């Protein structure tokens, strides 16, 4: 809705930075709204959905098993590892690692999963071979969050991200069991509190993945819809703002409000 566009323009003016935005019908694939959909934005932790997407693709091929247990060291623990720091002795399964990566945004869990698939270059190769020749991951956690101006490393466009997410959740790439698993992990997201979920009415379905980085980097990707079933995909990014985390959350929150209001 045009009223959602002005909120994005409102967000742009108040934050003093670019705001990437796109709205996409989950079923048909028709873009309902798009603001700067061809510009690049830092992915931040939103890449962790694409990460486990490649992981599930390997699971389908038999190259990976969700029950496989991975042990790791203390030297592997990077900043913000709320789950993986608790399992140095017993280790964690691939399933548990993806759960920590998508629900808790465990940075160490993400790196461990990246090692399984062959690193960021292989995640980029994965996205490339599913028709996404725009999105690229170059670095590991937490270096991928640097968000240097005009740096195209670890970035994406709202359009590429939205269509990629749709193809993972509902596309022909992954099996039915894996599509359900990925959206289940997203539905159980714990660290997207003051965003789209803040404007989400009761009974509405949401499965998302938020992100935060340096230099005012904020973002979220989500499949949601009323009556407990997802019907649209929403992708929103921003970077460059000197604003606090609080306003960046509330700006994206206000964008979600008009989205719901003019559903």
Swiss-Prot record:
PANTHER family according to UniProt: BETA-LACTAMASE (PTHR35333), BETA-LACTAMASE-TYPE TRANSPEPTIDASE FOLD CONTAINING PROTEIN (PTHR35333:SF3)
Protein name, as recorded: Beta-lactamase TEM
Organism listed in the record: Escherichia coli
Phenotypic consequence of residue 213 to S: In TEM-3, TEM-4 and TEM-8
Superkingdom to which the source organism belongs: Bacteria
Active site: 45 (acyl-ester intermediate), 143 (proton acceptor)
Keyword hit for Signal: yes
Family: Belongs to the class-A beta-lactamase family.
Keywords: Antibiotic resistance, Disulfide bond, Hydrolase, Plasmid, Signal, Transposable element
Reactions listed under catalytic activity: a beta-lactam + H2O = a substituted beta-amino acid
A biological process term (GO) from this entry: beta-lactam antibiotic catabolic process
Effect caused by changing residue 212 to T: In TEM-5 and TEM-24
Result of altering residue 14 to K: In TEM-2, TEM-3, TEM-8, TEM-16 and TEM-24
Molecular functions per Gene Ontology: beta-lactamase activity
Ligand binding (substrate): 209-211
Coiled coil: none
Biotech use: This protein is used as a marker in many commonly used cloning vectors, such as pBR322 and the pUC series.
Pfam families assigned to the protein according to its UniProt record, in alphabetical order: Beta-lactamase2
Gene: bla
Bridged cysteine pairs (disulfide): 52-98
Other notes: The beta-lactamase present on pBR322 was cloned from plasmid R1 (R7268). The class A beta-lactamase family has a specific amino-acid numbering system, sometimes called Ambler or ABL numbering and often misspelt as Amber. A multiple sequence alignment was used to derive a consensus sequence and then the consensus was numbered taking into account insertions and deletions. This allows use of identical numbers, e.g. for active site residues, despite differences in protein length. UniProt always uses natural numbering of residues, hence there appear to be differences in numbering between this entry and some papers.
Function of the molecule: TEM-type are the most prevalent beta-lactamases in enterobacteria; they hydrolyze the beta-lactam bond in susceptible beta-lactam antibiotics, thus conferring resistance to penicillins and cephalosporins. TEM-3 and TEM-4 are capable of hydrolyzing cefotaxime and ceftazidime. TEM-5 is capable of hydrolyzing ceftazidime. TEM-6 is capable of hydrolyzing ceftazidime and aztreonam. TEM-8/CAZ-2, TEM-16/CAZ-7 and TEM-24/CAZ-6 are markedly active against ceftazidime. IRT-4 shows resistance to beta-lactamase inhibitors.
SUPFAM superfamilies: beta-lactamase/transpeptidase-like
Effect in UniProt of substituting residue 139 to H: In TEM-6 and TEM-16
